[PDB]
């Protein structure tokens, strides 16, 4: 058969690294048309929904342990923030063919035997009876479950215990003093105000609630607009109708309230924020049906249960939440310590998310922009409720570990009180008994309640060839999936053992492989051998160690936790970019680059090293978190002009600021063009701030104050070019050399 072939390469001969590989699709899934009932591209699972670290599964345990390649699944149920974009095919008839034993769903890999009267399950080979209903002007072969790997169903009454819930939101807002002065409150209110129609309300049932919190928990009763403020304070921290209201039936009132709030706590001098008590208050407010508690704050919990200092009550809160289908989202914004490492556990185990805004301050018109944009996109995001996800494996395969935000205790079942759209997940697969067939399969199932009062089941079926050839296992390895696997292993090792252990683990993943390929595969001199499809793995793991999440050296507690929270839940495509940045060479940009083809054309990316940063060029760095506009100190006044308006390069805007519009400068338009293209994503809420940094010249003048402020930028931006030597960490070139030295005799 067409089993992918091993393409040997010398890593030492590919420097700088062929970073264009980061954008290639993983190795093909070698499955002949016969194993598929209706051969099409849509017949096997796409990499956008599921990616196995191995697309040529070892036929037995001893061969997997020998490869030293991990067996895991990068699973992403949804592909966009809004469900109306590129949805999978939807079934409505209600017929759900499922194996009597393993309970797997009908899929493109089942086999119809005996006059197509009965079907043999591809997961457990059991003979099942074909419902006569499977033949009602079309045949059984026109049904999605048989045509597609990725499809969805309208769940019958027996997949729901209670009636689908309305999307419910409870905004737990920090009205303490730190919040007034920073403007977080204003910005938060204003944003809700500007997006009350952006919140999903596909069934007109969406219900909203509002809790303002300082040293007391402030509630508000909201009348139906049709029957035309009531603030209810509660200082007893040891302690429904018209509290959680219809967004449609009380629109004007909700708006009226939101407009008053800012005036109320305007002169608030209280510096208290009883998160714990507020959380429990919100809890009792929606525990009846379940929903999202969205917290916004810029003040470390300091009163009531759950208070923290420079805990575990939260970990118990999440357990309770799993009982009443509640998800918690956190927006932490302040210059002060917020203990993200600890609050992130709230979101983490409820399927929610945490977003941290270091140094937030309304005094910087650009801070507001980032927080507001992300917050708005966040509340506009579609989500499910009462969802549970499980991955079934064909005979011999077993799901052992589960990573990502969600609740999972001692099962192969992950519970999502609400399943967001912007995260990704990962399952470790084990191979117990030896596989007999030439194919093994994995089927992910999602029993959900959409935000349209509907009960659905989304299925993802993946078929992979089996093999006893080590060479073959390697040739079909998904470097980006594998990288992801170890990224998670690293987050665990750290958040549970130690940072150094993490690095040690990351570097070993690369050694074990380079060592394994060497001894188990067979003229030249002294090269570092590896196959082409894994040619970016060493670079990624190495680059990973320089990431703010695993770095050696000093990194503030909040920033570190934040970095770790993001890496563990980010979608593959954004994870790789966060580890290795897209860098663009602007001054010698191609004429198409910067202009449309309303989608703009971007230049080709250049390696992440300062060796390419000519001292007279223009570079833009995108690390998924921010954008860095670096302009060489020796920039010709002409270039300096086309971008900022002046010829004086020492007059340029510094720090976190946007690029001014320079009229009659097609170049200024192309730059601004590219920036905005890098900011438009329909699958993440991320709003990347721009940091403008000035390189150093041969004749650099006197500005002692700036010197400090600027040295920080050149430093920060410099630390992004992960191929370079940085501090006590070696360059990528050296990294490769060090590895050659270790796998030798």
């Amino acid at each position: 058969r067409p089993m992918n072939q091993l393409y040997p390469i010398d890593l030492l001969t590919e420097l700088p690294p062929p970073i264009t590989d980061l954008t290639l699709p993983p190795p093909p899934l070698v499955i002949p048309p016969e194993r598929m009932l209706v051969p099409s591209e849509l017949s096997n699972a796409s990499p956008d929904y599921i990616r196995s670290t191995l697309n040529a599964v070892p036929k037995n345990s001893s061969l997997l342990k020998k490869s030293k390649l991990p067996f895991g699944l990068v699973i992403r149920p949804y592909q966009h923030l809004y469900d109306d974009i590129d949805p999978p095919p939807l079934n409505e008839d209600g017929l759900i063919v499922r194996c009597r034993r393993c309970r797997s769903y009908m899929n493109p890999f089942v086999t119809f035997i005996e006059q197509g009267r009965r079907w043999r399950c591809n997961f457990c080979r059991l003979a099942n009876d074909v419902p006569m209903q499977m033949d009602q002007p079309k045949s059984r072969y026109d049904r999605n479950e048989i045509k597609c790997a990725v499809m969805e169903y309208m769940a019958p009454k027996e997949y729901t215990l209670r009636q689908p819930p309305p999307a419910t939101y409870c905004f737990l807002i920090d009205v303490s003093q730190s919040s007034i002065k920073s403007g977080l409150l204003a910005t938060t209110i204003n944003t809700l105000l500007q997006n009350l129609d952006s919140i999903p309300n596909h069934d007109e049932r969406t219900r909203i609630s509002i809790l303002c919190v300082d040293n007391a928990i402030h509630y508000f009763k909201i009348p139906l607009d049709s029957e035309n403020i009531n603030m209810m304070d509660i200082a007893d921290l040891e302690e429904p109708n018209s509290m959680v209201v219809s967004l449609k039936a009380c629109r004007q009132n909700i708006e009226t309230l939101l407009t008053k709030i800012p005036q109320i706590f305007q002169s608030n001098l209280i510096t208290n924020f009883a998160l714990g008590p507020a959380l429990k208050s919100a809890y009792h407010l929606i525990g009846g049906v379940g929903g999202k508690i969205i917290v916004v704050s810029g003040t470390l919990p300091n009163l009531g249960i759950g208070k923290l200092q420079r805990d575990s009550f939260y970990k118990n809160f999440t357990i309770d939440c799993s009982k009443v289908q509640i998800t918690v989202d956190l927006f932490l914004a302040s210059e002060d310590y917020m203990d993200v490492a600890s609050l992130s556990n709230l979101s983490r185990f409820t399927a929610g998310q945490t977003h941290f805004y270091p140094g937030f301050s309304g005094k910087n018109p650009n801070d507001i922009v980032k927080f507001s944009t992300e917050f708005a996109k966040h509340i506009s995001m579609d989500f499910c409720m009462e969802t549970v996800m499980r991955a079934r494996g064909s005979t011999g395969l077993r799901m052992s570990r589960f990573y990502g935000h969600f609740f999972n205790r001692s099962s192969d079942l992950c519970a999502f009180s609400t399943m967001p759209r912007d995260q990704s997940y990962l399952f470790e697969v084990n191979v117990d008994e030896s596989i007999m067939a030439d194919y093994c399969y994995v089927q992910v199932a999602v029993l959900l309640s959409l935000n349209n009062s509907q009960r659905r089941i989304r299925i993802i079926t993946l078929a992979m060839p089996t093999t006893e050839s080590l060479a073959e296992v390697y040739a079909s390895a998904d470097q980006l999936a594998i990288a992801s696997f170890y990224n998670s292993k690293a987050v665990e090792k750290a958040l549970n053992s130690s940072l150094d252990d993490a690095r040690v683990l990351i570097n070993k993943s690369v050694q074990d492989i380079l060592a394994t390929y060497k001894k188990e595969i067979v003229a030249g001199g002294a090269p570092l051998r590896l196959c082409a499809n894994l040619r970016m793995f060493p670079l990624l793991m190495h680059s990973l160690t320089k990431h703010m999440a695993f770095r050696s050296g000093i990194v503030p507690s909040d920033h570190r936790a934040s970095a770790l929270n993001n890496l563990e839940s980010l979608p593959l495509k954004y994870l790789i970019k966060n580890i290795y940045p897209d860098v663009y060479s602007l001054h010698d940009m191609a004429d198409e680059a910067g202009l449309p083809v309303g989608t703009i054309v971007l230049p080709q990316p250049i390696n992440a090293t300062s060796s390419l940063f000519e001292r007279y060029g223009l570079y833009l760095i995108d690390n998924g978190n921010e954008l860095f506009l670096w302009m060489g100190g020796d920039a010709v006044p002409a270039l300096v002009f086309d971008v900022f308006g002046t010829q004086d390069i020492f007059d340029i805007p510094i720090g976190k600021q946007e690029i001014p519009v320079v009229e009659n400068s097609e170049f200024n338009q192309r730059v601004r063009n590219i920036i905005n293209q890098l900011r438009n994503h329909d699958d993440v809420i991320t709003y990347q701030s721009l940091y403008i940094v000035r390189g150093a010249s041969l004749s650099e003048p006197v500005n002692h104050a700036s010197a400090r402020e600027v040295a920080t930028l050149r430093l920060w931006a410099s630390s992004t070019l992960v191929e370079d030597k940085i501090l006590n960490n070696e360059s990528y070139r050296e990294f490769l050399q060090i590895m050659k030295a270790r796998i030798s005799k």
Partner: peptide, 8 residues
Amino acid sequence: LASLESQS
């Protein structure tokens, strides 16, 4: 809700 997903 695993009870429902497994439909056992």
